[PDB]
Design a protein around this ligand. Sequence first.
Ligand SMILES: CCCCCCCCCCCCC/C=C/[C@@H](O)[C@@H](N)CO
Ligand SMILES: CCCCCCCCCCCCC/C=C/[C@@H](O)[C@@H](N)CO
Ligand SMILES: *C(=O)CCCCCCCCCCCCC
Ligand SMILES: *C(=O)CCCCCCCCCCCCC
Ligand SMILES: *C(=O)CCCCCCCCCCCCC
Lengths: 62, 62, 62, 87, 288, 288, 235, 235, 235, 268
Amino acid sequence: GAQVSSQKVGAHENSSTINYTTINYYRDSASNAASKQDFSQDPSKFTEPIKDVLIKTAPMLN
Amino acid sequence: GAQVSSQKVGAHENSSTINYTTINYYRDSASNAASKQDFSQDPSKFTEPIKDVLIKTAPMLN
Amino acid sequence: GAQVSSQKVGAHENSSTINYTTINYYRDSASNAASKQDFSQDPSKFTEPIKDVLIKTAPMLN
Amino acid sequence: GSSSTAATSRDALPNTEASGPTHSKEIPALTAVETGATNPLVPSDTVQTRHVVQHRSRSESSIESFFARGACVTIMTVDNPASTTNK
Amino acid sequence: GSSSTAATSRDALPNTEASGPTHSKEIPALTAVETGATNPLVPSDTVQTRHVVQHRSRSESSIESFFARGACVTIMTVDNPASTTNKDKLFAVWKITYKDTVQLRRKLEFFTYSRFDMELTFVVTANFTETNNGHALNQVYQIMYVPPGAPVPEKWDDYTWQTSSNPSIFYTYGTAPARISVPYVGISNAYSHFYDGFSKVPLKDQSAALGDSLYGAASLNDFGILAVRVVNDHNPTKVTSKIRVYLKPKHIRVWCPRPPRAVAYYGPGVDYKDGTLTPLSTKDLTTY
Amino acid sequence: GSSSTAATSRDALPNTEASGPTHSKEIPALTAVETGATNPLVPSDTVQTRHVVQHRSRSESSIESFFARGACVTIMTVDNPASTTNKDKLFAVWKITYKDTVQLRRKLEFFTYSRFDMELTFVVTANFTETNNGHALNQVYQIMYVPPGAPVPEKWDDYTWQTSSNPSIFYTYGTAPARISVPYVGISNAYSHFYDGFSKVPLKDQSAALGDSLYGAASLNDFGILAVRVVNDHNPTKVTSKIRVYLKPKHIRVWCPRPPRAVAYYGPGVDYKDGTLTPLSTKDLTTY
Amino acid sequence: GLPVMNTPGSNQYLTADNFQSPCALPEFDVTPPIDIPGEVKNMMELAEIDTMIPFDLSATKKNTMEMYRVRLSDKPHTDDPILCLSLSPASDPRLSHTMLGEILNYYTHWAGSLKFTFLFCGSMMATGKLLVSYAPPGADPPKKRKEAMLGTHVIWDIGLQSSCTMVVPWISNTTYRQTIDDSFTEGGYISVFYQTRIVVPLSTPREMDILGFVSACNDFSVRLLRDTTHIEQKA
Amino acid sequence: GLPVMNTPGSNQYLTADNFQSPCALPEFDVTPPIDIPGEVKNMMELAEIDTMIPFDLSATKKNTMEMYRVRLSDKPHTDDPILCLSLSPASDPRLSHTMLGEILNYYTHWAGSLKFTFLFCGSMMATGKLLVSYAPPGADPPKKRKEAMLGTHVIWDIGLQSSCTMVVPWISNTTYRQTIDDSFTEGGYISVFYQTRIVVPLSTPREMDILGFVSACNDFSVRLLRDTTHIEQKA
Amino acid sequence: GLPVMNTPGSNQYLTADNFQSPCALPEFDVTPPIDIPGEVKNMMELAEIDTMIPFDLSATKKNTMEMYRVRLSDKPHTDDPILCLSLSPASDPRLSHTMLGEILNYYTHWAGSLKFTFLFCGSMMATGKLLVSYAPPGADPPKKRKEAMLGTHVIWDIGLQSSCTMVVPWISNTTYRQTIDDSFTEGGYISVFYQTRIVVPLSTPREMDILGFVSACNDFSVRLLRDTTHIEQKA
Amino acid sequence: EACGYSDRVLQLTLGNSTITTQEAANSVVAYGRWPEYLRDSEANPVDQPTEPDVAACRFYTLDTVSWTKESRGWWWKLPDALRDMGLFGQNMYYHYLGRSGYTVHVQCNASKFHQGALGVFAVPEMCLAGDSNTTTMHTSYQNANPGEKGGTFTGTFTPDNNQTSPARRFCPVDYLLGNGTLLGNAFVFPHQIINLRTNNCATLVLPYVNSLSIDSMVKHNNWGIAILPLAPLNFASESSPEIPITLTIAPMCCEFNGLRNITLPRLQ
Ligand SMILES: CCCCCCCCCCCCC/C=C/[C@@H](O)[C@@H](N)CO
Ligand SMILES: CCCCCCCCCCCCC/C=C/[C@@H](O)[C@@H](N)CO
Ligand SMILES: *C(=O)CCCCCCCCCCCCC
Ligand SMILES: *C(=O)CCCCCCCCCCCCC
Ligand SMILES: *C(=O)CCCCCCCCCCCCC
């Protein structure tokens, strides 16, 4: 049941992808650690909540 | 001898089924933890212990 | 996710290559130990930084 | 090696089905407790219901889950006095 | 066996593209904030830019990353006096919440609704109170979780501490700080950082005092309480202990963003208090 | 599953080759250091050599190997007095750096620029100060990391210790020395062991005192500070503790080599002080 | 020895934890199980079984065989209530001690549809039509047939079929309700009335008793296990 | 028992650590999630939203609805500044408390391009041409159009399109800047001027207000999470 | 819980140990590396670079620009030494402080071939022939050309090629030598003499200086890392 | 459209009501989510819901307020503001539970010679600050819910000092959004700006927002409509000008559960 993943490597030694192994000991999801393998989304719903899609090169008001 | 199972996942992170690994260290069943992988049954033997099966849409007494 | 490598063996017992097993527990590279599997380079950039490559058998100045 | 893994204690309870009006000879609401039995009725039998996808579970109310907790059954008292004490 | 492993929180931000001069009918710089929208502009739209390969990431600013830290929500005080003392053995009762302290509360409050598995870590420290010299054997604490409805303890040693059903943590002094995980336990589909309403509806036909209730307050007892005590019997020499509770929100999700708390917190609600309403400092319009 | 495993740091150095007599126009021994280069000569170039199979390695002299050792960078002093004492409970505040001590600093300074993941190990020792006889329960230390900009603690017990966002280590006395890892956190592409310049540009048109700044000093606050305290409440009998911080540079890289510090360090910069400028000892030109 | 590093929670005792442990009686010849009748797999199964309600908890009737009997009579039609009851399964004195109420008090949260069945213990010669009502929270608790008639209800007609079942549908704002009296998670009102009036011939008893039973529908569940107040050990 | 050897860090509590731990409420029926509107995945998303700037933080205007209003007038052309501002997003009093500045104070380092949008709240009959400037550090902070004109700027012409956006490009020596006032990581100067002059007809207000907004460009990011000074608990 | 048994070394702190550990700054956006010139991979690389030797460490010349200058003259032929030096790279005052000597003092053991290069800083009109010698330990340290001539040496002829390199071959009984003065691991003697004599014409300086440099050959290595005495912190 | 169509000119139609506008700055849809009925997968209350449709899902025009040099701002709460509006209020009071979205149309016209900017904001769970410094969360149900006439913001925080007989009401200070946070940041919330020189009004389409699929409309207010003067009203030279701000709102895809006798609240 071992879950193997990739570490986004910062400062590399004078020493190919590096990995880290994770295994869940408990039956309850809540007991589990944070994956940190999270997703980004486009701000649109907040920065441009307007009915009629807007084109930056053209006049906002027309 | 490793026993791999599925965690019924509650509150999911902004991060496909998640699993948990279990291994038995002792020779005696009693030493083992509780699986919690249990079964439900129909209350019938208690809520309807009557000889002649009953149909809810029809008159209980006929 | 286990990383198996070779130990450069020094003083051998009256007892074929010997190996050592390594596994990364953390998601962050920084958390990881030092591989010590490092590389050497030729001193040239410091011992012979001269524009015109030099041949030891011949006159340095010509 | 690795071994991976009918109604489960943690399975979602039965979904509520959409139910309309009724003018029939069928009498679910009417019964006779004298027989020793309990009327298997559900909301849709006595009132007009909408369709509902049920997510709730009886996981925590299972025999194991109900008792799956360490409980205090006794408090034992012992001691270690000075050699001299008479007691 | 082994299971190995669209835009990721840790993916490199968009590269800056080479941009030359412009003499056109296209007007990116010009707009109208009145519409409710924010101009999606980028350096290359208003100035001549060079080509730049972007390596920077928003990894650390993600919802989980932003809260992925153990925060102190309360300090519980308990004790174990000499049998003789006239005053009662002091056992602690704390109503669980993130509002007793300000730091974590302000962070969670950047948003209206939230959802998450809760990780509680307990740091226990003890000490001697009297210029005495007698000692005390290693203490064992009992942290009992009492959910709304269950018999709340009235004595450091009454029947309730049996915890037949309630979850209890038996911590041993000097050992690695205690820790337990808790699922998303809300009676709602998500925790409400804010409730613009009441738990009761004041009915005309019914006496004023009866239909009354607190503003912005839902379940009089959201999540029950934490009842802590020192299991050890009364000791000749009195020893006072403190239990620091660290709360960390994991596997977390948040909805509907809000402007951060600008002025000193004043109670469990949004209420502000006189003399604290002037946050900003003096700085002239034309001074760098 | 299992992943198994050009010139390696631990590869055997070049074998010495058998060399006979010479009567030629080739002049290896002769050269011209003026060019800036060093004669790549080897024993076989100036003398008759035998064949030798070389087993020796430069493994231990590699950049990582050279620094692969925990070095003491500072000693923090904190305490926990009797409630009554008139003087304040002493909590420590240390500005993070490798220059407070000399050993590790001299090694890092063999080079202009550096890059590396940092491993901090904390050795904590405590003791009694007064010819008293009273005792004290096991102490729990709180090592809080306060980055530049964050509210620096003013009291052993003020609001800042909540560490809602800042990283804190809760160490328990008598237990294996605390340890944490830190990535390459520099605002630059590499740490600068030396900065031949200033943080400010003195502008004519502007008052002298304003444009002034320290020589060789960049960010007034490079990496913030380490704020340490004893979490336990004031104890009748006073106990003084010391926190020794061991710093080890891992996954390290270095650029542009330099001549080692030949004379006694005098402050955070390259400054030397009178009376310490005569390192070398007396030894005659013609004496073995 | 394999390099290990101890983490928070180490050496602690979580009464609710779930781990393995050494067996004090190794190789012990365990006595096999026999197919014993009446086996239960889930506490909810017991909640689904009809249990008699102690409706008349009045000063003199309470804690006696009488609290179970709701008395009716051949008296003239009145829009006034035969019996008023709050939908607080675990907290309301009349429901809190029934098989259902009792199991509910071992848990912090409850959800789903309940069903109330009423048994007419009067004589065969006795006819009548009653109105069983359920009024979801938020308004003036029904004190007259008029108001009660306006919400979820069932017009029970007395005859051969001794009993009548009224299903109290799962109607709530929150996904779960609290096993205690709480304005926010309130369930509403259950009331009973005379649709027409209990009619009886001569030589027959003008007064009779009606028994009432409560049980949980298959959509019913509970969560957050907890210690109950229905039992204690003062000393 | 398997031979193990404890290493440094053992039994310690790292507030920032990330490990597993026993669940106090085993098998607990968790309430599912509902598709709630307005969900956020990254703090930076909030920084990309336009937020009003408290420009006029003067003794009497500060901490009042007025600090947000930058007043202009039909007065004669002058090369003098309408408003001077330092590029210190997290430390500068006028930026530190804006949605962007506030999020920045939870972090030690900031990087990328910012964008300043100005809204002309004067009458439709009122015309004018303003000069919005950005001057990268290292020189005499602009006090006259002449100097400001020499650096990164935008000549805003007032008309139908109510607002004008000036993008402050990511121009720095270090890969990241400090969320505090620091000579070494200084951002430069943002200043505004009268290109020509606000002109208005008769029967029209010779004085009007212009609102200003700041937000982060898609190339913007922050790092090294930290506790902010914008809130406290003295006691 | 998995049965484990703690072994000796448990909970101890080995300053030289090499294990994993929790990261205080999770998910931290690390600033990438730029191709910076002059990167070093091994301390030995620095030892292979020619560094000037402080030969004349006499009472008055030491700790001054002069200690580096070995003075010669147009004087008559003499079998007497221009300069005597012991092969103790790390311990001998004249070698101990050179780039090579300095790195050697961070290590307990040294091995391999060294090379001594001499630069003639006299005038172009000045001719001469010098004898650079190396005498492996075990005998009377050379005090006269006669004896020095009998061991490993190089007859340097002064001309266009300003400098002359003499390679001191790895000649030892033990696989490694100690970075300190030690009879058992002694390296021998390095001495310099007048083969013929420095000759110069009229109108030319009869006295000139010769600079000397030391560096390590590719067969050179060091081991057993250790703290040096070349720097301290009394207080 | 080369054919004529434009951002400034719109026509909204719900049930028997239609709104037209020749000077609009487009329209905003809160969090990009258009109002919708409760899905089966997300549903809670099992009973057949009551969906009034056109009878309630139409445009109600509240009492017109007056904007002046002195005005500090106005506030309303949903559904509270519509509680007395025809068939929508009737259905809201007859049912235990109810959920609804809204199309908020704020009308405010003037002249090419007038100045000023109205900041129109839609705030989820708009909890406001009370008038008391000796006690907290004490604002009475009657005062927290003004109904159609709504409430107003104050440029200054003046504490209720009558400990004996407390006003038990809100003290919402303008620059602090009436809730402890800086107004300058209110823009992170679904909104539009009514800039006299650019547009007649503001149109906000609000979805049903909440920690629950459906809730108590009488006990709880889902949305808060805040209108503050970002830039003060100003005209030609008149020292005390004035212009009306008319607020028209329409419930959407709204539905109700738990039917019983009508709820008669103690609103005074
Ligand atoms: C032995 C230890 C057991 C610990 C038991 C903890 C269970 C209770 C956790 C409740 C979580 C509350 C988190 C904050 C919720 C608030 O925001 C609410 N007012 C919002 O809905
Ligand atoms: C709970 C413990 C957290 C520990 C936090 C440590 C983070 C700060 C580490 C800073 C690293 C500084 C290393 C030396 C850099 C100097 O050489 C600079 N002057 C050169 O750029
Ligand atoms: C999937 O996990 C199969 C591989 C198992 C690897 C060995 C597991 C190491 C110890 C796990 C026991 C789980 C603890 C409850
Ligand atoms: C089936 O278990 C084969 C896989 C074994 C995985 C490694 C087991 C981890 C340690 C177990 C030893 C048992 C302790 C008595
Ligand atoms: C790749 O690792 C698959 C093989 C896994 C071997 C068992 C791992 C031993 C315990 C690892 C758990 C990781 C600790 C976070």
